[PDB]
C-alpha cells in the first residue's frame, strides 16, 4: 500500500519537472545579449571604520543610509555615523559569540544574537540616555544565524536548528514557526512588501515562506553545497544565492527556475555574502579569498573587484539610497566604498 | 551638535581603550568532546575563559569557524571509547579539525581520559586498528594501548603541521589539568613568537 504513494511522489516529481522544462523559452544570456556592457567598475575606499578588536561577523545599515550597526565577536555592537566616522553607540553584549545584527526600520531598536541561542533586542531611544536590553527572545534550539525586523513589534529569525521563527517583541512569544529545511539555515532575506521571505540552508536549497500563513510556497535547488548568503532582487520577483561551491545563482520566483550562474574557473573559494545595487544590475559578492567581486547580474561577466581587506570578507552593506557599500572582514575593520 | 558628537566619541573611545586593554589580557579556549557554557578561571593572575558548545545539533562545519582565533582547542577523548568504534570517530574529528583552513593555526590540547576504564578493559582494541599487533612501546598492556592511541593522534597531527601549530597530548583531577592547560598555552605563545623570529 506504500508503493502507490511512492509512485504518487514520482508522478508529482515528473509533472513538476516537465512543467518546468516547458517554460524554457530561452536563456537569460540570450535576451541580454544586446545590452550595453557595464564596463570596469572602479570603486575606492572612502572611510575606514576602526575600533573593533576581533573579527566582525555582521553589519546592517538602517533606513537613514547614514548610521550603521556592526557586531564583533569581541562582544561588541558598535553603531557608527558613516559620514563623520564617529561612534554613536557602543553596546557590550552578554555573550561574546555573535553572528548577526539588525537595525530596525524606525531606528529605535537594535537586535543581535549568536551561539547563545537567544535574540537580544536593545532599545536606543530612552529617557535614561543609556542603551538597555529591552527584550530577550528565547526558544531556538540552535545558534541564530540571521535576524530581520518587520517593524518595532515583529522580528523574523533563522537558527541553526533548521527552523525559522516570527516573534512578537512585546509579549516575547513565538507566533509562527517555519519548518522544512533539512540543514542549518544560514541566511534570510525579507521581501520589500514584508509578506514573503526567502531562506537558504546547508542542504543546498532555498525556500520561500509566506509570513501570514507559515507555509513554504516554493523550493529552489541547483547549488552543489551549502548556501551561505541570500538576497532579494529590488523588485521582489527574484533573488540571488551564494554558496560554498564558489558560484552565485540568480533564481526567479514566477518562473520557478534558476535564471543565471556567476562563476569563474580561477575562483575556487566560497561566497560569504551577497547584495544588489539600488538598480539591481550590479551583484556584489564577498569571497573567502579576501576580495569582493562586482558581477553584471544581466551579463554574468565580472565587472569589478574590491580588494582592500587582508582577511575573510564576512558581510556586505549596500545602502538604501545606493550611495555607498559597506564591507566587514575578519581583520576587524569596516570599509566604505563609493 | 558636532561638538556633542565629538564628546560622545571621546567617551566611547576611552571606554573602548579600557575594553581593549581588558580583552588582550584574556585567553579563550574551545572545549570539545543554554547555547554555550562559559567557565572562567585564573592561574598565576592570568585569566582564562573556556567555552563548552552544547545545545547544538552535531553539525559543526559552520559554528566551528567562530573559534578561528582561540588560543587553543581542548580536545577530550575517552581512551575506552552495540558498541561502536568511537575512537575512530574521535580520530576522524581530530583529522577534520587539523586540516580545516580556518583552524590551520590553532594548536590542540589532547586529553586522553578514562584510563582506568581502558585498564580494566585490556584484560577488543585489536579488532579495530590491526596495527596494534605490531606496534611496540617507544601492566604493559595499558601502556601499549594508551601510547598506541597517542601515536595515532600524533601521526595524524604531524602530517600537515606546517610548523604553525602542534598537539599537546596528556593522560588524564582538575589541578594538573588546569596547570597543564596553562603550561601548554605558554608554550603555544612562545612557539608562535619563536617561529615569527625565524628561530623555529
Amino acid at each position, epitope marked *: 500500500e506504500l508503493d502507490q504513494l511512492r509512485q504518487e511522489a514520482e508522478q508529482l516529481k515528473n509533472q513538476i519537472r516537465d512543467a518546468r522544462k516547458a517554460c524554457a523559452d530561452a536563456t537569460l544570456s540570450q535576451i541580454t545579449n544586446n545590452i550595453d556592457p557595464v564596463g570596469r567598475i572602479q570603486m575606492r575606499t572612502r572611510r575606514t571604520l576602526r575600533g573593533h578588536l576581533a573579527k566582525i561577523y555582521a553589519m546592517h545599515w538602517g533606513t537613514d543610509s547614514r548610521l550603521l550597526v556592526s557586531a564583533s565577536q569581541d562582544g561588541k555592537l558598535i553603531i557608527w555615523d558613516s559620514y563623520t566616522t564617529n561612534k554613536v553607540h557602543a553596546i557590550p553584549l552578554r555573550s561574546s559569540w555573535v553572528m548577526t545584527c539588525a537595525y530596525a526600520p524606525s531606528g529605535n531598536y537594535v537586535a543581535c544574537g549568536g551561539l547563545d541561542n537567544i535574540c537580544s533586542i536593545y532599545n536606543l531611544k530612552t529617557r535614561e540616555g543609556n542603551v538597555r536590553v529591552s527584550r530577550e527572545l528565547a526558544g531556538h534550539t540552535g545558534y541564530l544565524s540571521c535576524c530581520r525586523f518587520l517593524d518595532d513589534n515583529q522580528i523574523v529569525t533563522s537558527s541553526g536548528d533548521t527552523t525559522c521563527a516570527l516573534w512578537d517583541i512585546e509579549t516575547g512569544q513565538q507566533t509562527t514557526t517555519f519548518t522544512g529545511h533539512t540543514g542549518d539555515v544560514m541566511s534570510l532575506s525579507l521581501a520589500p512588501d514584508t509578506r514573503l521571505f526567502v531562506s537558504g540552508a546547508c542542504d543546498a536549497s532555498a525556500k520561500l515562506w509566506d509570513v501570514r500563513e507559515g507555509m513554504c510556497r516554493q523550493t529552489f535547488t541547483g547549488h552543489e553545497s551549502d548556501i551561505n548568503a541570500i538576497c532579494f532582487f529590488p523588485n521582489g520577483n527574484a533573488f540571488a544565492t551564494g554558496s560554498d561551491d564558489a558560484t552565485c545563482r540568480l533564481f526567479d520566483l514566477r518562473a520557478d527556475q534558476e535564471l543565471m550562474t556567476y562563476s569563474h574557473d580561477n575562483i575556487i573559494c566560497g561566497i560569504t555574502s551577497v547584495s544588489f545595487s539600488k538598480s539591481g544590475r550590479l551583484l556584489l559578492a564577498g569571497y573567502d579569498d579576501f576580495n569582493c567581486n562586482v558581477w553584471d547580474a544581466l551579463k554574468a561577466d565580472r565587472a569589478g573587484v574590491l580588494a582592500g581587506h587582508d582577511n575573510r570578507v564576512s558581510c556586505l552593506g549596500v545602502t538604501d539610497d545606493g550611495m555607498a557599500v559597506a564591507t566587514g572582514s575578519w581583520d576587524s575593520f569596516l570599509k566604505i566604498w563609493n | 551638535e558636532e561638538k556633542g558628537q565629538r564628546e560622545a566619541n571621546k567617551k566611547i573611545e576611552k571606554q573602548l581603550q579600557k575594553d581593549k586593554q581588558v580583552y588582550r589580557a584574556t585567553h579563550r579556549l574551545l572545549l570539545l568532546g543554554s547555547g554555550i557554557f562559559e567557565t572562567k578561571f585564573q592561574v598565576d593572575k592570568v585569566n582564562f575563559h573556556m567555552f563548552d558548545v552544547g545545545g547544538q545539533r552535531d*553539525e559543526r562545519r559552520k559554528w566551528i569557524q567562530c573559534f578561528n582565533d582561540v588560543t587553543a582547542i581542548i580536545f577530550v577523548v575517552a581512551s575506552s571509547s552495540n558498541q561502536t568504534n568511537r575512537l575512530q570517530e574521535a580520530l*576522524n574529528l581530530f583529522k*577534520s579539525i587539523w586540516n580545516n583552513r580556518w583552524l590551520r593555526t590553532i594548536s590542540v590540547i589532547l586529553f586522553l581520559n578514562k584510563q582506568d576504564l581502558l585498564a580494566e578493559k585490556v584484560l577488543k582494541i585489536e*579488532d579495530y586498528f590491526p596495527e596494534f599487533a605490531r606496534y611496540t612501546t617507544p601492566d604493559p598492556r595499558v601502556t601499549r594501548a594508551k601510547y598506541f592511541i597517542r601515536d595515532e593522534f600524533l601521526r595524524i597531527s604531524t602530517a600537515s603541521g606546517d610548523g604553525r601549530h602542534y598537539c599537546y597530548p596528556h593522560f588524564t583531577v582538575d589541578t594538573e589539568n588546569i596547570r597543564r592547560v596553562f603550561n601548554d598555552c605558554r608554550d603555544i605563545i612562545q612557539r608562535m613568537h619563536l617561529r615569527q623570529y625565524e628561530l623555529l
Partner: nanobody
Amino acid sequence: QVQLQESGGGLVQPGGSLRLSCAASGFTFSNYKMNWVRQAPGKGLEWVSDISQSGASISYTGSVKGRFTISRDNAKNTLYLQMNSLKPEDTAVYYCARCPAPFTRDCFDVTSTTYAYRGQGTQVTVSS
C-alpha cells in the same frame, strides 16, 4: 538536485564477495572527496572508508583493512566498494557520502544522522 544512489547489496553467505556501486548526480564528481559509511542494527553511523579527488589517497577503518577496496571512476561519476571475505559483523545499511565542500581536505559531518549529501543506502546481510 544532488543525488547519490547506492546499489549492489544483497544476501551472501559468510566469506563471500560483493561489489557496491554508488552513482552520483548533480555535481562535479571529481572535485569532491567521497566516503563509504555504514549503520548496523541497533547502532550509530560508523565511517567505513574514504577516497580523495584524484584517487590516490585512500583510507580504511581498521575493521575492514585487507578486505575492502574503494575505487572511483570519474569518467562515469561512480564510486565502488569491493568487499571480499565478508563476515557476519558486516550486516548493515551502507551509504555513499560526499564531503560538504569541494577542493578541501577536511570532511565534516558525514556521519551526523541528518547529513544532506548522503544517499539512501543499500542493505547487506551476511548469514546462512
